[PDB]
Scaffold this active site. Structure first.
Site, PDB file in Angstrom:
ATOM      1  N   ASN A 157      18.313   0.234  64.046  1.00 45.28           N
ATOM      2  CA  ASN A 157      17.130  -0.403  64.535  1.00 45.28           C
ATOM      3  C   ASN A 157      17.262   0.013  65.356  1.00 45.28           C
ATOM      4  O   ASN A 157      17.137   1.605  65.684  1.00 45.28           O
ATOM      5  CB  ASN A 157      18.340  -2.079  65.505  1.00 45.28           C
ATOM      6  CG  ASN A 157      18.837  -1.606  65.990  1.00 45.28           C
ATOM      7  OD1 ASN A 157      19.072  -1.291  67.184  1.00 45.28           O
ATOM      8  ND2 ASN A 157      20.420  -1.516  65.909  1.00 45.28           N
ATOM      9  N   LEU A 206      27.160  -2.353  56.964  1.00 45.25           N
ATOM     10  CA  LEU A 206      26.387  -1.294  57.749  1.00 45.25           C
ATOM     11  C   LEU A 206      26.336  -3.408  59.092  1.00 45.25           C
ATOM     12  O   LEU A 206      26.403  -2.551  60.324  1.00 45.25           O
ATOM     13  CB  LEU A 206      25.138  -1.806  57.216  1.00 45.25           C
ATOM     14  CG  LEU A 206      24.567  -1.041  56.011  1.00 45.25           C
ATOM     15  CD1 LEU A 206      23.136  -1.344  55.751  1.00 45.25           C
ATOM     16  CD2 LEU A 206      24.943   0.311  56.207  1.00 45.25           C
ATOM     17  N   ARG A 266      15.768  -5.153  68.234  1.00 42.46           N
ATOM     18  CA  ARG A 266      16.581  -4.881  67.271  1.00 42.46           C
ATOM     19  C   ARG A 266      16.808  -5.768  65.316  1.00 42.46           C
ATOM     20  O   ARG A 266      17.525  -5.334  64.676  1.00 42.46           O
ATOM     21  CB  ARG A 266      17.986  -5.983  68.330  1.00 42.46           C
ATOM     22  CG  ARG A 266      18.756  -5.733  68.941  1.00 42.46           C
ATOM     23  CD  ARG A 266      19.434  -6.546  69.573  1.00 42.46           C
ATOM     24  NE  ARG A 266      20.466  -5.760  71.061  1.00 42.46           N
ATOM     25  CZ  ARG A 266      21.200  -6.591  71.960  1.00 42.46           C
ATOM     26  NH1 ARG A 266      20.691  -7.806  71.599  1.00 42.46           N
ATOM     27  NH2 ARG A 266      22.116  -5.928  72.409  1.00 42.46           N
ATOM     28  N   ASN A 267      15.534  -6.674  65.701  1.00 41.01           N
ATOM     29  CA  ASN A 267      14.828  -6.881  63.970  1.00 41.01           C
ATOM     30  C   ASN A 267      13.894  -5.356  63.499  1.00 41.01           C
ATOM     31  O   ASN A 267      13.097  -6.296  62.932  1.00 41.01           O
ATOM     32  CB  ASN A 267      14.491  -8.441  64.668  1.00 41.01           C
ATOM     33  CG  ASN A 267      15.607  -9.608  65.016  1.00 41.01           C
ATOM     34  OD1 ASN A 267      15.121 -10.679  65.250  1.00 41.01           O
ATOM     35  ND2 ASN A 267      16.922  -8.598  64.356  1.00 41.01           N
ATOM     36  N   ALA A 310      17.030   1.863  55.859  1.00 44.35           N
ATOM     37  CA  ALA A 310      16.500   2.568  56.664  1.00 44.35           C
ATOM     38  C   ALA A 310      18.034   3.468  56.741  1.00 44.35           C
ATOM     39  O   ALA A 310      18.375   2.523  58.558  1.00 44.35           O
ATOM     40  CB  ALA A 310      16.111   1.423  57.760  1.00 44.35           C
ATOM     41  N   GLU A 313      15.283  -2.703  51.347  1.00 45.73           N
ATOM     42  CA  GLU A 313      15.391  -1.093  51.520  1.00 45.73           C
ATOM     43  C   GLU A 313      15.509  -1.125  52.760  1.00 45.73           C
ATOM     44  O   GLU A 313      16.156  -1.746  53.590  1.00 45.73           O
ATOM     45  CB  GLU A 313      13.589  -0.759  51.982  1.00 45.73           C
ATOM     46  CG  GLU A 313      13.291   0.801  52.558  1.00 45.73           C
ATOM     47  CD  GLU A 313      11.784   0.734  52.949  1.00 45.73           C
ATOM     48  OE1 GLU A 313      11.851   2.056  52.748  1.00 45.73           O
ATOM     49  OE2 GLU A 313      11.317  -0.463  52.754  1.00 45.73           O
ATOM     50  N   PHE A 317      25.519 -14.622  60.777  1.00 49.24           N
ATOM     51  CA  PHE A 317      24.904 -15.178  59.894  1.00 49.24           C
ATOM     52  C   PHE A 317      24.813 -14.723  58.429  1.00 49.24           C
ATOM     53  O   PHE A 317      24.542 -15.204  58.085  1.00 49.24           O
ATOM     54  CB  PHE A 317      23.021 -14.542  60.256  1.00 49.24           C
TER      55      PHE A 317
HETATM   56  C1  LIG Z   1      20.515  -8.695  64.650  1.00 44.25           C
HETATM   57  P1  LIG Z   1      21.684  -8.988  63.510  1.00 44.25           P
HETATM   58  O1  LIG Z   1      22.000 -10.880  63.119  1.00 44.25           O
HETATM   59  O2  LIG Z   1      23.315  -7.775  63.655  1.00 44.25           O
HETATM   60  O3  LIG Z   1      20.926  -8.185  62.351  1.00 44.25           O
HETATM   61  P2  LIG Z   1      21.861  -7.972  60.556  1.00 44.25           P
HETATM   62  O4  LIG Z   1      22.531  -9.362  61.011  1.00 44.25           O
HETATM   63  O5  LIG Z   1      20.577  -8.475  59.946  1.00 44.25           O
HETATM   64  O6  LIG Z   1      22.613  -6.905  61.313  1.00 44.25           O
HETATM   65  C2  LIG Z   1      22.609  -5.617  60.375  1.00 44.25           C
HETATM   66  C3  LIG Z   1      23.463  -4.849  60.921  1.00 44.25           C
HETATM   67  O7  LIG Z   1      22.662  -3.474  59.889  1.00 44.25           O
HETATM   68  C4  LIG Z   1      22.028  -2.978  60.245  1.00 44.25           C
HETATM   69  N1  LIG Z   1      20.417  -2.986  58.928  1.00 44.25           N
HETATM   70  C5  LIG Z   1      20.596  -4.712  58.491  1.00 44.25           C
HETATM   71  N2  LIG Z   1      19.492  -4.057  57.790  1.00 44.25           N
HETATM   72  C6  LIG Z   1      18.978  -3.090  57.659  1.00 44.25           C
HETATM   73  C7  LIG Z   1      18.386  -2.103  56.803  1.00 44.25           C
HETATM   74  N3  LIG Z   1      17.258  -2.646  55.649  1.00 44.25           N
HETATM   75  N4  LIG Z   1      18.935  -1.116  56.763  1.00 44.25           N
HETATM   76  C8  LIG Z   1      19.762  -0.384  56.842  1.00 44.25           C
HETATM   77  N5  LIG Z   1      20.346  -0.934  58.115  1.00 44.25           N
HETATM   78  C9  LIG Z   1      20.063  -2.203  58.504  1.00 44.25           C
HETATM   79  C10 LIG Z   1      21.214  -4.262  61.408  1.00 44.25           C
HETATM   80  O8  LIG Z   1      19.927  -3.270  62.086  1.00 44.25           O
HETATM   81  C11 LIG Z   1      22.513  -3.643  62.124  1.00 44.25           C
HETATM   82  O9  LIG Z   1      23.318  -3.056  63.023  1.00 44.25           O
END
Ligand SMILES: CP(=O)(O)OP(=O)(O)OC[C@H]1O[C@@H](n2cnc3c(N)ncnc32)[C@H](O)[C@@H]1O
Ligand SMILES: CP(=O)(O)OP(=O)(O)OC[C@H]1O[C@@H](n2cnc3c(N)ncnc32)[C@H](O)[C@@H]1O
Ligand SMILES: CP(=O)(O)OP(=O)(O)OC[C@H]1O[C@@H](n2cnc3c(N)ncnc32)[C@H](O)[C@@H]1O
Ligand SMILES: CP(=O)(O)OP(=O)(O)OC[C@H]1O[C@@H](n2cnc3c(N)ncnc32)[C@H](O)[C@@H]1O
Lengths: 288, 287, 287, 288
Positions: free
Chosen positions: B108, B30, B153-154, B104, B102, B31
């Site tokens: 974001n 879909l 974004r978070n 989503a 969960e 550190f």
């Molecule tokens: C802000 P970042 O470090 O990109 O955040 P992350 O490393 O969690 O990136 C995850 C990617 O997939 C998305 N994402 C993260 N967690 C979920 C989730 N629980 N459900 C749906 N999409 C998610 C998130 O918005 C981003 O597009």
């Protein structure tokens, strides 16, 4: 001025002579984009790569970008190190302008040229070029700390370029003995003393080079296949090491294993690696 | 009894949260990395539910690993809330760490709003989004957690358009300790940081309120980037000099004053999340 | 060749600086501990000279060990100077780390001045002390070192009343890297720190000039404690608000303006050490 | 207000009811002085100890003093933990007011009562009291990280008091896995995982307790005699441990060695140490 970076005229590039273009990718710590720089050196427009911050930049991201720029100036120019061309540090966002490498990073470069193209000689040449780049870096009293295939770029003419100096350090006078904790380094490329003993020397970079060699001979494989970083801390202490890549000779695998000796002083120096690889390369290169 | 050296892994057990690896099927990314997945029995013990799984990449650093573990730990402390992405389970034994949360479906908030800009979002929807997030933060603060990384974004959005606060890797537990003068905040997004977090080595719930104000601005600009045209490079000095963002086009004076109040220089002069919820509830009702 | 496991110690060799353990006799004590000692042949290969030896205590931490090693490394980089305590040798192999330095029989400057307050110090002596220290700092800065811990307690005085800058455990080498936005400075003495070192995650030679101004105040007050009556606890806000120390009784307007110039909020507006040496030389000559 | 600390009325003590006296000593991180606090609890004046900053205080010193105050409030009261009595946090310098222990720290207490006075039973009692204090601390979800004889105080009635909570952490919810580097902890009291693996658990405090036990039975001896901290990192990895104190029985030495098992889960818990020490103490105490 509302900005903070000091002037360095010799490297400053005029913002109106730089045209930003297509994004090359996001590094979570910033972004790189292609651009045209007029007269960056001839009043000709040369294609370059520009590293800059993203809107959600942190102070570590900003300090890492500035550190990378400073380290590149210290290292100097070398055929196997991505070249710094200039920077825009005044009156606006920080832009670090560097040589553009059309073939991307080494991992993808190798993966896109796998067999059902790379020849064995090509793999040895890549390794030799990188050993030369590191031998030079080390002679400049720099420890890279983040040597991985993803952090090596390839030019249109297939030249290997060591890149990403954001985590590198200048050990000309200070060696950070017992004060370099290394929690921001990629675990699967880290020497045991870097992981456990709060030190980092050129011999630690030799260990990483051994892992890079493994990445090259597996044509872009991911280190310690099937072994999560989560269990590697104890496995490393227990003496475990990666196995021999299929397209690797015993001689080259022994070189990797020597880079992975637990005792740092038992590992070869980059000078020694360059000498051995030059011999091996010559002997694998057709002389007809 | 247990023999020594059975596992080379390091995380301690927590049975109540442990999920069977053989019941989890990893899917498309879909550190670290988050991927969709199917988890059988995580809910009907035979029904497979769609979830998101956060895990480490091959180039993971010790900070990355400690951050993922910290996120998992913080989610357990915080507990369940309608406006917080919920933790469903974790695989911590005999294999890579998988934090199951969960899923989503709408991504974001930043992207969500950007894709719904006028050529489908209504003003009422924006206020609702803001209120939901204020409620989530009020709960988080009551659970004595400081998030430290609140940005659009978070924030994730579900199929039913519910706002979910996410990404607790930088969050801290201040139930007993407040980290006074020892939290340097170099890993927080500058454009969302309160002045005291940037300059004074502290971070309190009032610093999260400042971030909430920036989030409000992101929301009413339909996913715009804060301090437009202003590089983070010059923001340190601009902020000390008192500069603040202007009012978004689709924002009333009342809501803008709320944003400006979240950006008072003196932390105690900013509203509390409890006050923000009360005010937003009133506004929402009158909209 | 060398067999493995001959030494369980960790420091690399540096022969030119290594001193024989059997030629060093540790004496009475004076992060670690400093003790007087006799070193035979460190100078006449048979003559024993009185020196000071810095070493770790039994409760040493890894920071303490890394600080002592860093101090030794910085002293080698800096080189010899009349107004800097000189490094004489070190025992780094096969035993505890002993950093051997020049012994200053008159102790630190703070105590030195306090013991010479009017019921034997003259105004001319104070100016001379200040000039000597400005010369030492000008040299240190030319060697591209930032000290970061310049206080009167960190200045030593020899038998011949020569000022010697000491304590380089927190110093940094900025020949090539300047640590911009990555030096948080939480281990520096607050009352001697420039505002940008306290709030902005930077440290330049101009920050050492601010510290030099505080040192000047300590000198003209005959070893007084900076910001009298003002707890460090409220100094963070007072400094941002523009507060500065008052003029010492035994200080001329000219010297006080020098102190105030070292405390300009904008670093580039402060004098450089080179300018301070030139100005102090003139004042000293006219005194 | 020009100050920064938040109000906490229940613990605030009036500055005009506190009279500072003779300095108890300098800790390089601050200073402790004796004082008289009226009505700190009866409008009677009780002798107390006050911890405060020095003029050359750093931000770490200030944050450590505040952290110690906060940790003491979380831990609560216990017979074997130095008691927090109150603090002056408003309108002036930070004063953390704590119970005054007239006999000083344990190391000096034992050294001043050596033989050409401490009895063997007294040493076992000291150890038991400290095990009880740590068992309580651990149950309060606190890791001390700096348990040494110098950090234990003794009252006029010879009660052992665990002190110096400036480096302690609250692990009620977060355990700092892989993010606690421990470079500010005393090396000779550190468990191997604390030194090398970026973790710190109650079992790490058990290791330190074993070293404290050794300090007690050597009547204030300095750990790893003749072995510099400089070579201990490798010696520890190699399995080396301290020898048995003269005034220690095999049973007590086995307890120390068990606290020093390389594998943390193999070490006894403080609950188990308290149970064993209670048995040993009872059997060494005359019942006539
Ligand atoms: C802000 P970042 O470090 O990109 O955040 P992350 O490393 O969690 O990136 C995850 C990617 O997939 C998305 N994402 C993260 N967690 C979920 C989730 N629980 N459900 C749906 N999409 C998610 C998130 O918005 C981003 O597009
Ligand atoms: C591994 P990462 O942090 O994304 O690394 P970075 O963000 O620097 O690079 C992102 C993308 O841009 C590529 N890239 C970076 N620098 C250059 C360059 N100088 N020339 C060509 N491509 C580059 C890089 O290989 C990757 O494809
Ligand atoms: C400021 P601090 O941490 O006490 O500094 P340090 O730990 O070096 O303390 C050393 C004590 O002995 C003094 N001292 C340190 N070095 C020397 C020396 N080279 N010659 C004489 N006295 C010294 C110093 O002033 C202080 O009184
Ligand atoms: C080991 P250090 O850092 O000096 O430790 P600290 O600075 O706290 O203590 C300095 C001196 O004051 C003593 N001390 C500290 N706290 C108390 C107290 N509450 N009662 C009596 N003496 C104390 C301590 O044992 C030592 O003798």
């Amino acid at each position: 001025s509302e900005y903070e970076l000091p002037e360095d005229p010799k490297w400053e590039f005029p913002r109106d002579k730089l045209t930003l273009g297509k994004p090359l990718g996001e590094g979570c710590f910033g972004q790189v984009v292609m651009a045209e720089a007029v007269g960056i050196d001839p009043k000709e427009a040369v294609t370059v790569a520009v590293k800059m911050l993203k809107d959600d930049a942190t102070e570590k991201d900003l300090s890492d970008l500035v550190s990378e720029m400073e380290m590149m100036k210290m290292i100097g120019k070398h055929k196997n190190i991505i070249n710094l061309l200039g920077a825009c540090t005044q009156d606006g966002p920080l832009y670090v302008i560097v040589e553009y490498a059309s073939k991307g990073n080494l991992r993808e470069y190798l993966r896109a040229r796998r067999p059902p193209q790379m020849t064995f000689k090509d793999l040895v040449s890549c390794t030799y070029q990188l050993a030369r780049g590191m031998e030079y870096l080390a002679s400049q009293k720099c420890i890279h700390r983040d040597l991985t295939a993803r952090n090596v770029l390839v030019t249109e003419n297939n030249v290997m370029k060591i890149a990403d100096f954001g985590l590198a350090r200048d050990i000309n006078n200070i060696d950070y003995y017992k004060k370099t904790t290394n929690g921001r380094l990629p675990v699967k490329w880290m020497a045991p003393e870097a992981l456990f003993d709060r030190v980092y020397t050129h011999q630690s970079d030799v260990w990483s080079f051994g892992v890079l060699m493994w990445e090259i001979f597996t044509l872009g494989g991911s280190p310690y296949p099937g072994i999560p970083v989560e269990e590697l801390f104890k496995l490393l202490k227990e003496g475990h090491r990666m196995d021999k890549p299929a397209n690797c000779t015993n001689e080259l695998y022994m070189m990797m294993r020597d880079c992975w000796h637990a005792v740092p002083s038992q590992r070869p120096t980059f000078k020694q690696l360059v000498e051995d690889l030059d011999r091996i390369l010559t002997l694998t290169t057709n002389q007809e």
